[PDB]
Design a protein around this nucleic acid. Structure first.
Lengths: 905, 368, 364
DNA sequence: GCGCGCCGCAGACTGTCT
DNA sequence: AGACAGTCTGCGGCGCGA
């Protein structure tokens, strides 16, 4: 029990085995590269009555859990698979929303579709909001066009409510809606934004094509450019880029699916959409029919290649996500846009002030000794006792009327004469509609924004004439390192030896912290710029995606009784929800990909709009109960480590540490070893994650080039010992024989659930010289399988015990659930039991049925009203508690009592 | 030191005596110069336009202080609560605003002194006692207003603070070279002041929020305008932030006030001619640029003609936006010389376009 | 006839029934309302036109505002305040501003405290007087005094609707060589509005030591002793001139300087919604100087009945028709000044013809 | 890793202004 | 009959969507 800091076996304690001839090898290995004499003080014991398992084994317990649910969904999928649909109905009509078409075209008005299995897609007009415009619902019974009542001239003027389609048939059943990008469709289903759960679940054909026969980022680029370096072209034809009219001919086979060159939905006029109805309906119907045929091809293949039901149930659970907004989303967007505009005006005004200060030169020729402004033009060109109200106004009027005489031109050809040429270029003409004062129309993309602020890179001209990105501005008779160092650059450029080849995509957003790159020694207006740029960079990158997110505001009737007559309820405010539009598989590693959410955003300071994660606020009477899982990729690599060389989490030094290690004290191996061997200024996590994914020595070297002023020969000779010390090579602390052995194996890739890799990366007729993506896939897909194991649990805990919730949100190794305020402790206890069961399941699949207590439970289960990294955090805005009510959160590391989950106590 | 003697040299400050630090801040300064009364007229009008007339709710309070001198400017505003809620429209949300002069006791030099502060006070009648979003809206408005007209808007900061009974409040600070100084305070008085002033009956204090009568909360936003003017002068010139040698080798003393807050905009001149007929066209231009909102500096009246560099330095230190110089060539061609405060270069332009260009410049500076 | 309770329905709770001829000439009264404060600001701007336009080297000054002054040190809660001692203290600095050019003056609008005695005790006045000090050479004192009397008489009669009643009297001379006093004829006789005193060098030589080094600024290439002639005006109101009589016109105040009765924004949308047709006139608030009363915020159609009697009280110079009849055609303006003429609004009657008829009256 | 947008920038012509 | 304002237009780079 106390061998490696492990706990007793609560379940499955009938048979125990410590192994033989393994403890000696483990001890001998841990003598080196490890102190091994740590006292390892125990965590206090926790013992509770778990809910009754089934099958007398945890694997069978999860099997019956994942088969009890997703069985009506599976039979609905089978019924949709077995159907032999009629081809098409020739007749299409408006018919006031929903209507029913049989095998032949016949108009009959029906309220709602009464069908279990259904394939559905929505086409929207980007010109007119995010409101749905076209929809067809193909079923084995009928055809079910929707038409989105577009014939009515009057619109709702935003504030979407009751506008889209409806599919839930009401109690007075189960539905597996299929579609291509079914999350975008799910945004248009209605009652998905309702706070109460819905039985309907969604399956994505894109997730199917990405899970099996998907393409890695490099692979997709190669397949695009091709519609050692050379290899067998089998994966080129086997996989596709996930766009339809490319997947359809791959799976179904036949004529290519149509592609409209006009693209009226994305860039078309409202009146253009209103007519030309039948061709758009035909295109949408062909699209949905192709999606149905691709799913019909893919479903048995997915069932065979992903047999274990936890994977399918986890994908179905990830199909349903819920982000409530609590009416402060519009205020957030308004304040973020106002702050972005204000800081942009501040930076532009600072640029104008710098330009005006530069214009104060040329008096006595004070330029050409300034290293920054020497090479500009700086040229000059020129081409009553008595009421005496008269003789004052009359003389001025005479001089005004004398404009014609001796005038060079009625329309001025001299645009601000007497000013330098670069300043004339930065000034709009004196025409009244387009006049703006000072050196306006000045931006950072122009070459004149440099040389006005120093940038401290010695002489920083940014003269984009044979520069190729960068030049002699790093380090070392003016050819040597001089502040000026800029004349006759072509014969003796030297400088940067790698030339062009860097990505050059926001590369200079870092390196402002140290690394030279300071916008002037002064402090008045120079260094204020490039700090405003830091603040507004994230919003400039993401304001298209953060704005225009579809929000459906629930009316008073749609709100439940918990929201009504609550103390935190306001009649004026209207509560809404956001569906994240996440695809359950968007990478060959089956983790969800979505640009807006699911990023490394934790309300970082010196940023304008990094509070994206915040303001996802629960409705009154509701709370977010969720936990950030502890650093898990390292644990996955460690558990792939043990049972290969030895068991009991003690075979290698990697298995010995990383779990008892803490961030507060001691070495957790995440940063401490990296900052001991190398510099690792906060970049230790990226380096460790790159090592875990097996990126290799060139990627590590290129990553370390961007972080310090280290030479290439110095990089090869020195500070590259991390690879030579962690890894012994190709067959110390790190080993890769298990991951490589999995990679060479064809079918058994996932140790836990048996999910197979995509057919592009299979060894059958495909050889991967690069080798990194497969081991990266093994690690990340094991993490995804862990997430699926968490998500299949916490269900039937909300069913057999009456708990309202089960709206999972997975961002980045964390889970959130929208639970009622009365059941938050029950949700926290259920989440802790879920984490314990998931860790025991992963260990049981990879060896032995005993788990250490350190990783057996969460550090803290955050119960909040909004979503944030920690309960004791605030956004960078001047006042987070002021305005919107915030309870500041509680950690809930320890449960209230040892009491069970059922309501009686 | 150098900034203060520069101010008194061009009379943006009061007098030579009691010129040292924390004497103008205390309010015991003798006053302001002839150009110092302006920017107390430019301010308290930009504040008035931003707060009072633009917001349809905000209305001026009754004239306060018709014994003890006033110090907070808040007591009289609550005294005029009854007349604020008019019979024809007893709408609770709208509030009161005032700009005045307040008297403060000053100790530590002995005899107690009286400090004078120009205070702008806005009292807001928030209909919910626990709304707290009107405070955030007013904080955003005040902060963006102070950052407006500022050469370095980053120096205007805000700090949260709490007092007894835990009233919630914000205190704006400006980063002077010696240290941060308090400019404006937002405080939730919490309706206890209204109960103290009117303990007789509560029915008069109810106001209509939506359809229902509720007791309001009062929010006091009090800013100072003398120290605000000192902040605006210190924002211009230099606050010892830059210093250095290679940053600014040029030695130019210029007060880069905002065009919408500059005391006097254009300065008329006479030079390069002994005819003395130029005085006539300069007086005509003087009459032309007025009644358009532009205030002109009659530098053409002086008999003595100093050097152009000294005149330009004087106009820069007086925050002159544009310098107009009228040669004898204006009698022939009509071309007048125009120099800008921002850019030292000068250009020849026709006299007819001058007023239109100046009013367009002021308007566009106001918008931006 | 009283005009304080009948015509001035908008008043203050303090001394609501105690308002008469007394205590209004004197400063012992509750302050003026929002309309009174805005009218005082307008009158202060019109007086400041004599500072910005009549720019004979006239500059603004600010007094220390103390009721006793800057203490009483070294000399053997005040009799009166006049904003004059601050001007004579700023004499040296404001003479340094010019190149010692003597014909220059200093003007200031500020609060002056006057103790009230023998009330029908020691109350604070705060009569908000306006002062001009006008440092002048002694030889041209009479001509400059007559000059300032003539322009002050013209300025005070400029807003006066009725002839006479802005009388000027030579009175007597005790404080200085000579002076003149302006009297407005209320129904309770003529009372002082503005006074002139040719003080001379006596006060300036009294405040400073006997030896002179910074004084005697040059005029006509000869340094001469400076004479002082002071213009002091109580900022009283022309409300009695606004309502000369009621007669059949029933109680109307003519808007010569009134912030209200030249305004906008009323109507709140004809179809009980979409108020941006009228509220969208808020561009008259930006870059202009038009004061607009938000009557649309009232949105009480029951109170808007009896339009003839509602024009007496509300008077925002136009109203939008309540019935959904003239939403189109781009015209809502009506009841302009005395007679309804009902013309188009976009460029004719809103943002234009409101700036006009005021500047033309200003020039007249 | 690619492709199609959106800006900067330097032409080569165009069009009055002489 | 020159000659320098401006109007498309071919280049480099940045950047964001798969």
């Amino acid at each position: 029990m106390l061998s490696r800091g492990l706990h007793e076996q609560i379940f499955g304690q009938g048979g125990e085995m410590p192994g033989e001839a393994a403890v000696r090898r483990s001890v001998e290995h841990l003598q080196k590269h490890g102190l091994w004499g740590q006292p390892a003080v125990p965590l206090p014991d926790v013992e509770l009555r778990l809910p009754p398992l089934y099958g007398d084994n945890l694997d069978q317990h999860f099997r019956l859990l994942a088969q009890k649910q997703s069985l009506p969904y599976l039979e609905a999928a089978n019924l949709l698979l077995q159907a032999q649909l009629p081809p098409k109905p020739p007749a299409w009509a408006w018919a006031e929303g929903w209507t029913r078409y049989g095998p032949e075209g016949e108009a009959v008005p029906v309220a709602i579709p009464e069908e279990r299995a259904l394939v559905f897609d929505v086409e929207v007009c980007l010109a007119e909001g995010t409101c749905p415009t076209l929809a067809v619902a193909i079923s084995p019974s009928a055809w079910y066009s929707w038409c989105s009542q577009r014939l009515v001239e009057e619109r709702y003027s935003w504030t979407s409510q009751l506008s889209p389609a409806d599919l839930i048939p009401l109690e007075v059943q189960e539905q597996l809606v299929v579609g291509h990008n079914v999350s975008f469709d799910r945004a248009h289903i209605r009652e998905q934004y309702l706070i109460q759960g819905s039985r309907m679940r969604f399956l994505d054909t894109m997730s199917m094509h990405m899970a099996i026969s998907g393409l890695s980022s490099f692979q997709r680029s190669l397949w695009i450019a091709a519609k050692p370096a050379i290899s067998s072209w089998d994966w080129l034809d086997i996989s596709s880029v996930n766009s339809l009219a490319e997947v359809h001919r791959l799976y179904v086979g036949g004529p290519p699916l149509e592609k409209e060159p006009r693209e009226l939905f994305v860039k078309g006029t409202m009146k253009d959409i209103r007519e030309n109805f039948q061709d758009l309906m035909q295109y949408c119907a062909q699209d949905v029919w192709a999606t149905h045929e691709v799913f019909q091809q893919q479903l048995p293949l997915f069932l065979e290649r992903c047999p274990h039901p936890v994977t399918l149930a986890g994908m179905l659970e990830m199909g349903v996500s819920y982000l409530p907004v609590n009416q402060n989303w519009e205020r957030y967007l308004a304040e973020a846009q106002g702050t972005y505009e204000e800081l942009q005006r501040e930076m532009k005004k600072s640029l104008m002030d710098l330009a005006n200060d530069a214009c104060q030169l040329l008096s006595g020729e004070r330029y050409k000794e300034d290293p920054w402004l020497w090479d500009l033009e700086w040229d000059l060109q020129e081409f009553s006792e008595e009421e005496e109200f008269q003789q004052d106004v009359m003389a001025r009027a005479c001089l005004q009327k004398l404009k014609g005489t001796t005038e060079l031109l009625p329309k001025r050809p001299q645009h601000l004469p007497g000013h330098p040429g670069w300043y004339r270029k930065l000034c709009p003409r004196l025409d009244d509609p387009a006049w703006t004062p000072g050196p306006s129309l000045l931006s950072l993309q122009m070459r004149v924004t440099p040389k006005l602020m120093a940038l401290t890179w010695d002489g920083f001209p940014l003269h984009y004439s044979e520069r190729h990105g960068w030049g002699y501005l790093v380090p070392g008779y003016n050819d040597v390192d001089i502040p000026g160092c800029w004349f006759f650059k072509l014969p003796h450029k030297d400088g940067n030896s790698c030339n062009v080849g860097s990505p050059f995509a926001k590369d200079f957003l870092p390196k402002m912290e140290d690394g030279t790159l300071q916008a002037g020694p002064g402090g008045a207006s120079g260094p204020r710029a490039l700090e405003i740029n830091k603040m507004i960079s994230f919003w400039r990158n993401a304001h298209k995606r953060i704005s225009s997110q579809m929000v459906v505001w629930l009316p008073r009737s749609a709100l439940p009784r918990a929201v009504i007559r609550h103390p935190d309820y306001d009649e004026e405010g209207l509560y809404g929800a956001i569906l994240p539009q996440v695809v359950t598989a968007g990478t060959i590693t089956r983790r969800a990909v979505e640009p807006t959410w699911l990023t490394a955003s934790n309300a970082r300071p010196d940023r304008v709009g990094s509070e994206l994660k915040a303001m996802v606020q629960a409705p009154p009477g509701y709370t977010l109960v969720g936990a950030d899982v502890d650093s898990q990729e390292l644990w996955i690599a460690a558990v792939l480590g043990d049972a290969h060389f030895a068991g009991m989490h003690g075979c290698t030094a990697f298995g010995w540490m990383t779990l008892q290690g803490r961030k507060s004290r001691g070495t957790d191996l995440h940063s401490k070893t990296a900052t001991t061997v190398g510099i690792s200024r906060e970049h230790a996590k990226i380096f460790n994650y790159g090592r875990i994914y097996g990126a290799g020595q060139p990627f590590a070297e290129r990553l370390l080039m961007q972080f310090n002023h280290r030479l290439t020969q110095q990089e090869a000779a020195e500070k590259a010992q991390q690879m030579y010390a962690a890894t012994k090579g190709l067959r110390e602390s790190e080993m890769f024989n298990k991951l490589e052995s999995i990679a060479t194996s064809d079918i058994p890739r996932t140790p836990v659930l048996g999910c197979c890799i995509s057919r592009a990366l299979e060894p059958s007729a495909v050889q991967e010289e690069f080798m990194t993506s497969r081991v990266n896939w093994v690690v990340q897909s094991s993490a995804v399988d862990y997430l699926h194991l968490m998500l299949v649990a916490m269900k039937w805990l909300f069913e057999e015990f009456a708990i309202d919730g089960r709206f999972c949100i997975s961002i980045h190794d964390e889970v959130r659930y929208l639970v009622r305020e009365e059941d938050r402790y029950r949700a926290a206890l259920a989440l802790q039991i879920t984490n314990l069961l998931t860790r025991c399941m992963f260990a049981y699949k990879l060896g032995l049925n005993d788990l250490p207590q350190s990783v057996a439970f969460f550090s803290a289960v955050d119960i909040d009203r909004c979503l944030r990294k920690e309960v004791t955090m605030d956004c960078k805005t001047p006042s987070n508690p002021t305005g919107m009510e915030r309870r500041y959160g509680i950690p809930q590391g320890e449960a209230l009592d040892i009491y069970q989950i059922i309501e009686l106590t | 030191a150098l900034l203060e003697i520069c101010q008194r040299r061009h009379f943006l400050s009061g007098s030579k005596q009691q010129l040292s630090r924390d004497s103008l801040l205390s309010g015991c300064h003798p006053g302001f110069g002839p150009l110092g009364v302006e920017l107390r007229k430019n301010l308290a009008a930009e504040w008035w336009t931003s707060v009072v007339v633009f917001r349809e709710q905000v209305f001026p309070v009754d004239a306060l202080h018709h014994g003890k001198l006033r110090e907070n400017l808040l007591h009289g505003a609550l005294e005029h609560y009854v007349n604020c809620l008019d019979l024809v429209n007893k709408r609770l949300p709208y509030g009161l605003a005032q700009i005045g002069v307040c008297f403060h006791p000053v100790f530590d030099t002995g005899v107690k002194s009286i400090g004078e502060k120009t205070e702008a006070s806005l009292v807001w009648f928030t209909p919910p006692r626990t709304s707290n979003q009107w405070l955030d809206f007013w904080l955003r408005h005040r902060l963006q207003w102070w950052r407006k007209f500022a050469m370095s808007p980053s120096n205007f900061s805000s700090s949260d603070c709490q007092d007894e009974e835990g009233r919630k409040g914000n205190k704006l600070y400006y980063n002077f070279p010696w240290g941060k100084e308090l400019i404006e305070t937002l405080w939730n008085l919490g309706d206890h002041e209204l109960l103290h002033m009117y303990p007789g009956n509560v029915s008069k204090l109810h106001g209509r929020d939506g359809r229902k009568n509720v007791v309001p909360c009062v929010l006091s936003v009090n800013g100072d305008l003398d120290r605000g003017m000192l902040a605006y002068l210190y924002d211009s010139f230099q606050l010892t932030e830059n210093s250095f040698t290679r940053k600014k080798n040029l030695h130019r003393k210029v007060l880069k006030l905002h065009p919408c807050l500059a005391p006097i905009k254009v300065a008329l001149d006479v030079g390069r001619g002994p005819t003395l007929e130029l005085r006539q066209v300069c007086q005509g231009l003087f009459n032309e640029l007025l009644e358009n909102g532009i205030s002109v500096w009659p530098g053409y009246l002086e008999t003595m003609q100093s050097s152009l560099e000294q005149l330009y330095s004087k106009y820069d230190e007086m925050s002159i936006l544009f310098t107009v110089l009228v040669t004898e060539t204006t009698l022939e061609n009509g071309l007048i010389h125009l120099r800008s405060r921002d850019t030292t270069m000068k250009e020849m332009m026709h006299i007819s376009k001058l007023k239109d260009f100046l009013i367009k410049y002021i308007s566009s500076a106001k918008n931006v």
